[PDB]
Amino acid sequence: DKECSSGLIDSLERAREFHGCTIITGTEPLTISIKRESGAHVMDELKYGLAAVHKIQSSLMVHLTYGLKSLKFFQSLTEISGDPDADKYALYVLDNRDLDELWGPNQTVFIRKGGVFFHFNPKLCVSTINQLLPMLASKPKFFEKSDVGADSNGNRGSCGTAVLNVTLQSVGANSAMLNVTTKVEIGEPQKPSNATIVFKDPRAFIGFVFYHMIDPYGNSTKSSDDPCDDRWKVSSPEKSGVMVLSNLIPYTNYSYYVRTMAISSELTNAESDVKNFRTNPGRPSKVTEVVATAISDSKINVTWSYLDKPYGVLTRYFIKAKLINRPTRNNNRDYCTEPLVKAMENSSQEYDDRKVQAGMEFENALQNFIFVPNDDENTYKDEEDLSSNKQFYEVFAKELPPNQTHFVFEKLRHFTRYAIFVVACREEIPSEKLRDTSFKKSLCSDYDTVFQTTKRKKFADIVMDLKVDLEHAESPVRVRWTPPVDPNGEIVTYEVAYKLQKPDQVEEKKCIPAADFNQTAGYLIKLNEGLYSFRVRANSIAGYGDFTEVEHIKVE
Amino acid sequence: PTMRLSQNVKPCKSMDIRNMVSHFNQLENCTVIEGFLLIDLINDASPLNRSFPKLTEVTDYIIIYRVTGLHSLSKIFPNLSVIRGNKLFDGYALVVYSNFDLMDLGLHKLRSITRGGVRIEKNHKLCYDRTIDWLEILAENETQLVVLTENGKEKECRLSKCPGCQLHNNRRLCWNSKLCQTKCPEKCRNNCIDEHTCCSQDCLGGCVIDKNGNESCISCRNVSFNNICMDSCPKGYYQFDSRCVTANECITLTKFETNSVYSGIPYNGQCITHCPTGYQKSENKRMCEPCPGGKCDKECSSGLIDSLERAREFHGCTIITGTEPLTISIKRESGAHVMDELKYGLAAVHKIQSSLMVHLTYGLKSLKFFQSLTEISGDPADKYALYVLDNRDLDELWGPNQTVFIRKGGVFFHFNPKLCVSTINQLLPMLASKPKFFEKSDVGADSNGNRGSCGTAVLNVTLQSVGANSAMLNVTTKVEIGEPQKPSNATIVFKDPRAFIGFVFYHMIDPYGNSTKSSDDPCDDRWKVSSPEKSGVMVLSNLIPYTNYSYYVRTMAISSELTNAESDVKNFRTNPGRPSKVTEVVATAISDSKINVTWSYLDKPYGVLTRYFIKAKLINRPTRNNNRDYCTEPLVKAMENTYKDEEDLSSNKQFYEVFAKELPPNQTHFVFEKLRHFTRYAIFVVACREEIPSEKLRDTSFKKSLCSDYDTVFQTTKRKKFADIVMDLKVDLEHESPVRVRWTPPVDPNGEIVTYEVAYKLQKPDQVEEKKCIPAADFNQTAGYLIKLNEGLYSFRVRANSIAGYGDFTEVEHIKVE
Amino acid sequence: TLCSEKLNEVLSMVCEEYNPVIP
Amino acid sequence: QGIVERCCKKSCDMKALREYCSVV
Numbered sequence A: 001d002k003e004c005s006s007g008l009i010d011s012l013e014r015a016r017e018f019h020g021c022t023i024i025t026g027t028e029p030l031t032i033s034i035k036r037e038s039g040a041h042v043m044d045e046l047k048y049g050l051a052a053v054h055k056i057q058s059s060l061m062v063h064l065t066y067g068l069k070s071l072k073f074f075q076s077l078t079e080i081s082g083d084p085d086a087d088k089y090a091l092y093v094l095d096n097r098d099l100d101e102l103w104g105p106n107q108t109v110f111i112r113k114g115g116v117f118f119h120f121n122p123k124l125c126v127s128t129i130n131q132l133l134p135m136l137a138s139k140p141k142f143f144e145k146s147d148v149g150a151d152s153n154g155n156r157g158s159c160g161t162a163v164l165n166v167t168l169q170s171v172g173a174n175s176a177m178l179n180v181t182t183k184v185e186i187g188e189p190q191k192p193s194n195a196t197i198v199f200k201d202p203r204a205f206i207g208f209v210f211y212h213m214i215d216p217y218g219n220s221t222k223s224s225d226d227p228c229d230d231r232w233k234v235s236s237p238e239k240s241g242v243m244v245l246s247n248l249i250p251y252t253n254y255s256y257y258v259r260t261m262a263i264s265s266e267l268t269n270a271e272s273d274v275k276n277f278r279t280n281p282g283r284p285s286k287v288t289e290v291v292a293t294a295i296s297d298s299k300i301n302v303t304w305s306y307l308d309k310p311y312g313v314l315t316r317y318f319i320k321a322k323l324i325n326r327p328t329r330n331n332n333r334d335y336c337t338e339p340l341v342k343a344m345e346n347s348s349q350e351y352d353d354r355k356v357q358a359g360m361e362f363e364n365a366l367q368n369f370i371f372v373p374n375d376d377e378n379t380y381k382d383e384e385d386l387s388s389n390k391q392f393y394e395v396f397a398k399e400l401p402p403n404q405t406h407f408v409f410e411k412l413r414h415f416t417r418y419a420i421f422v423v424a425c426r427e428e429i430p431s432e433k434l435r436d437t438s439f440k441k442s443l444c445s446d447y448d449t450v451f452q453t454t455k456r457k458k459f460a461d462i463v464m465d466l467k468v469d470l471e472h473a474e475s476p477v478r479v480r481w482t483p484p485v486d487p488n489g490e491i492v493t494y495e496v497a498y499k500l501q502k503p504d505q506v507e508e509k510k511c512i513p514a515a516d517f518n519q520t521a522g523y524l525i526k527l528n529e530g531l532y533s534f535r536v537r538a539n540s541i542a543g544y545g546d547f548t549e550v551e552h553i554k555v556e
Numbered sequence B: 001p002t003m004r005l006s007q008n009v010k011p012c013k014s015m016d017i018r019n020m021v022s023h024f025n026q027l028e029n030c031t032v033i034e035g036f037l038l039i040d041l042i043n044d045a046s047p048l049n050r051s052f053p054k055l056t057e058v059t060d061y062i063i064i065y066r067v068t069g070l071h072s073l074s075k076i077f078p079n080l081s082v083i084r085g086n087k088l089f090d091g092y093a094l095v096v097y098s099n100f101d102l103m104d105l106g107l108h109k110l111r112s113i114t115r116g117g118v119r120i121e122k123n124h125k126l127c128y129d130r131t132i133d134w135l136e137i138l139a140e141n142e143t144q145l146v147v148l149t150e151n152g153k154e155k156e157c158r159l160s161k162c163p164g165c166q167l168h169n170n171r172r173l174c175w176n177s178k179l180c181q182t183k184c185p186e187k188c189r190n191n192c193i194d195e196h197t198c199c200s201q202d203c204l205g206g207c208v209i210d211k212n213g214n215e216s217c218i219s220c221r222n223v224s225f226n227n228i229c230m231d232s233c234p235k236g237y238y239q240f241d242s243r244c245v246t247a248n249e250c251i252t253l254t255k256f257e258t259n260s261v262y263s264g265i266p267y268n269g270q271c272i273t274h275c276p277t278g279y280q281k282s283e284n285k286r287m288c289e290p291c292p293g294g295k296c297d298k299e300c301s302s303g304l305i306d307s308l309e310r311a312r313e314f315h316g317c318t319i320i321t322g323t324e325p326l327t328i329s330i331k332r333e334s335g336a337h338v339m340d341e342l343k344y345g346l347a348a349v350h351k352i353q354s355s356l357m358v359h360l361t362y363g364l365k366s367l368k369f370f371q372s373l374t375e376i377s378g379d380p381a382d383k384y385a386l387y388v389l390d391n392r393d394l395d396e397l398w399g400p401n402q403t404v405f406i407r408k409g410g411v412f413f414h415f416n417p418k419l420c421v422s423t424i425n426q427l428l429p430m431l432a433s434k435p436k437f438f439e440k441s442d443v444g445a446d447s448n449g450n451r452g453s454c455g456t457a458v459l460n461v462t463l464q465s466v467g468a469n470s471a472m473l474n475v476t477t478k479v480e481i482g483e484p485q486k487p488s489n490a491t492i493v494f495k496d497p498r499a500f501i502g503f504v505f506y507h508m509i510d511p512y513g514n515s516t517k518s519s520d521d522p523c524d525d526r527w528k529v530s531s532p533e534k535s536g537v538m539v540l541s542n543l544i545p546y547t548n549y550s551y552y553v554r555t556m557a558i559s560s561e562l563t564n565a566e567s568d569v570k571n572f573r574t575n576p577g578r579p580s581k582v583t584e585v586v587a588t589a590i591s592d593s594k595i596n597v598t599w600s601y602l603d604k605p606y607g608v609l610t611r612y613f614i615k616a617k618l619i620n621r622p623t624r625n626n627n628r629d630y631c632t633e634p635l636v637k638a639m640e641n642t643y644k645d646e647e648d649l650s651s652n653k654q655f656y657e658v659f660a661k662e663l664p665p666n667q668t669h670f671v672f673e674k675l676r677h678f679t680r681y682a683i684f685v686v687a688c689r690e691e692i693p694s695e696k697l698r699d700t701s702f703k704k705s706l707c708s709d710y711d712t713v714f715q716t717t718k719r720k721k722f723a724d725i726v727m728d729l730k731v732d733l734e735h736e737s738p739v740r741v742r743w744t745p746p747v748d749p750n751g752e753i754v755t756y757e758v759a760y761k762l763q764k765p766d767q768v769e770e771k772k773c774i775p776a777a778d779f780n781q782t783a784g785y786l787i788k789l790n791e792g793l794y795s796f797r798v799r800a801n802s803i804a805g806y807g808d809f810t811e812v813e814h815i816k817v818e
Numbered sequence C: 001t002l003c004s005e006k007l008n009e010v011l012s013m014v015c016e017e018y019n020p021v022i023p
Numbered sequence D: 001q002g003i004v005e006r007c008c009k010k011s012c013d014m015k016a017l018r019e020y021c022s023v024v
Ligand SMILES: *[C@@H]1O[C@H](CO)[C@@H](O)[C@H](O)[C@H]1NC(C)=O
Pocket: A163, A164, A165, A166, A182
């Protein structure tokens, strides 16, 4: 213990001096008179200062303070020895704006000596004052008007509250409807009983006010320590008791509560407890980070990750791959002059009351005088479509469990482009699957096509069945062969190279376009007498190919 | 001149069209309604067919309440020109309330409402209600008696198209879709026949123009007699709210109070309903007499004054008595006309036997209307004689020369936001016990006057010096402490050295210089309040240069001691400082010698931008990555302040090494010229402001920094022209010797030349070249590149290669080998 | 307690008719 | 007194309200 000296806490800074004090001593009364200018966080500082105190040797006083939401910050106070401030009083509470509650619900303070004092606390209910009645050592039957300001405490902090039931009628992807089922009795009904929430005059009721805000944890509390709070979205007041919260984010835990708004002169009020609900699933976000890469001629690799909220529970990823035709040589572009090696792509709220009050009084004034007294799919599904020749897939698709982030294909059309989706899908709610027809689904995300190509080919293009002829034993030598069985893209030029088997001789090669073979699929080359060797190869829009095996001829 | 009225006017006493349509018959022949006219509780009005063009004006007021089967109010009022409003119902002259079938007003001929105002409410089928500028119709004095609400204007009534009609105040002005409203200039004060044809001032509401050119008033502005207007009634006749009548005639004219059927008394030339203060009517009810002395007293019972109209029946009461405290609770949308009625209601009273209570009032400005109150007697509201709670408009208590003796009990005050505590303290000597201070349990300190400026004293704050980041303030007004050092001359004394905490300064950014003040509640307290200072000298720091701030000074004291002073807001602008960096600079290559720079200034300039500035510097191009063999893999294509005007030129004058040009603040684009081909360039885009006169007339040449900071942007001229390749090619046999090809390298390389391609081809058809690679360097050592070649005819081409990439081949040449 | 619109309706339901104020 | 002070600030009955009529 420390038995710290009592004093006047003119500000939060001076409150810091009282940190760790378990007992407060000093004949003069401890005084709390903290203002709060252009700031917040009065509660944390004060409690950090006084939370340790458990007994006050002298009386306690707190007055001329703003933003002091409550006196509950005495987190350990249980005794007030009550040495006074005046000889009659031991707790002195005066002119405390926005002060609304004494000690916490499970806390009691023993006023050892003297009575209490309360006046001009506009936000503190009189009934909350009487909670102290059984705690005093004197055990009085009630508080005298001289000690408690019955008609000057909490005059606009009404606390005759009664609870309101609330229920959700319907929810949707971005909206929900709210009811209030505890029937408020706007205007005394004069026949029936029940309806405890009754307004003696119908004009006195402005309307229900709906509060709602996003809360992933579903534990947000009504009030706040800061005297100003704007996390709640406050709706306009209506008397119907029905509201339709809209522009909501699907599949997010919302929290809401309602309060009845009445003219300043009406004492009765009502509030509901904080309730929670979810906004149903929506369209899952498009798959992020997707990227595709080549593995080999007939095999491609796809990886993706889901880095944004799914708006639901993933049921299965869906992968589709459509063959997109490989490029065709542009006939207006020359070859054997520009050969190809094929580099490849890829605030104040303060409700005002004057208008309604004036209208209400004018109504009464009038009646007293008038009366007298006498391009994208929607049908994703498993599917494989093997080409007619049956070597490669022209369309491949599959479903995957939601935990499989990567997938590979096989038996592709070797060198070619491919367009692929990576789309997520979420589970269907009963109201959709057993209440709606198969249209407007929207239960699967959009996709961003990724274009990727395979590798050229393991053995690449080749020209088999080569043979060379020399007829009439006067005609020039000629070469014969067959085009590639499965050429990459299409062959653009045939390049027949040959060499002379003699020292100081180097291979030199012709160059012709893919055409000029329609007559017999044979090509003729003049040559002089000697022993030579030939070797043909093909060139394709996919790039250069490999030579065949050599051949030989002895010209003469 | 003497003036006539149109038509021979016939009056008819106050009327109440009630229950059934057939009761409209009594409204026949009524030129002017002597009193009030009310039409109410007609379940169905459709059957009526006859209009009433004769009805011209009404003295007191018009009320329409719960009449249905009526669509156009013109059905009853074709020529309702002027509403005189000698007597008002709750301060209102025209009332249209709770009517479901009403859609059209049709008040084309209406011109002037002389007193009070109009309330149109709860008419869901009504439209055009908000279109008419009632301000033109009401009196030139206070006009706020205008309440137009709850008339189906949500969405459906938005079909209020009006004709097409004149358009003013961002709206059309029309009674209905086919009746444009009429104004007139100030010279007529809204009694003109049309926009320009204005009659004499003798008329009210207009006049008929005779075929002979003579005017004929629709109604006299002043009283009337024998169908002629004049300033005042002739002798022997008494005014009765629109005209002059004999005493015997006036004796018969009745008027209707809340319930009383009063009859006029002809006295001092006025047919007054009841004798004025200090007078009593003769028992024969023929004239008014001073009664038995000035004390013509009259006692009345206390009660609840819930509205102005309820207050009227207290007129003439000198004494108020009854165990029930007299409570004032009048609540009005605005106190535009409350005082004029409350004064008539209660000004006669001088002593109250019971307590006075004033709570839940709206529109009370003060208790001045208790003009003769002198004693309260505090009979109760036990232990409280005066009671003032929750009056969000009350401003001050009895007038300065008034004094009310509260014989018994104390007083209570609370939630009076505009009631200044200084005014409260004027009651201290008025209590019977005359205490020196109120008990803390009976009058609040923050509950009262927390929002009204009320008293205090004005404080003179002056700005001393300013900078680009800071400012400094004085407070010229003196402050006397404790015993006043010298009386008089705006001392603003604090009667205790302990009391005066110090001055508090506020400031906050406001371009328009029209922010109001620091509010009394959390949030919206955007003022950066400084800590209190005793000296009155304060410094503001960390200010944004060239921004219009607003500041004011307020004092404070211990225990909220009521002697305090405050100052009005003022505005000042910080110095220009340094302009920010130019925004979004982009450089593009136009040609081999031109770069195109585009920029914008989407940022706060400070001051005024006076001179843009662009500078470009040559940066030597990259050269010779010798770590890599270019022949193995060649590069095919490439990738990517204090100053004065004018540039620098190269020795050969083919390019600018550095270029710098001043620009006018218009410019957003610029293009250089004579720039080096294929070389990176560093680009500035600098903006500058004007210099403050002090900065050159009282500052030496240092620091300055009138120009923004520079961020460099790089770009390269594109590839040069197609030319600039190997020149002067020739080939010949060295002699069986190898062939040699010789040439000269380009004089203007596209970057240093790294490799040479000797592309040679046989002349035989369908042939392709076998180009060889030479890694430059040793090219010309032998005065020509040797090449082995066999017998045959060939064509030779040569091209260069640089960091810029491949060049293009020179024209072919031929050689034959054997 | 009958006030405002509710009392207006009660009056409409009762007596089917009202009396003058200044007949 | 009128109406509100009779039937708004306090309750009324089918007789206490029957006096404001011309017929029944
Ligand atoms: C309605 O409120 C009452 C208390 O007033 C409570 O007992 C009851 O359970 C509530 N019912 C629902 C459906 O919320």
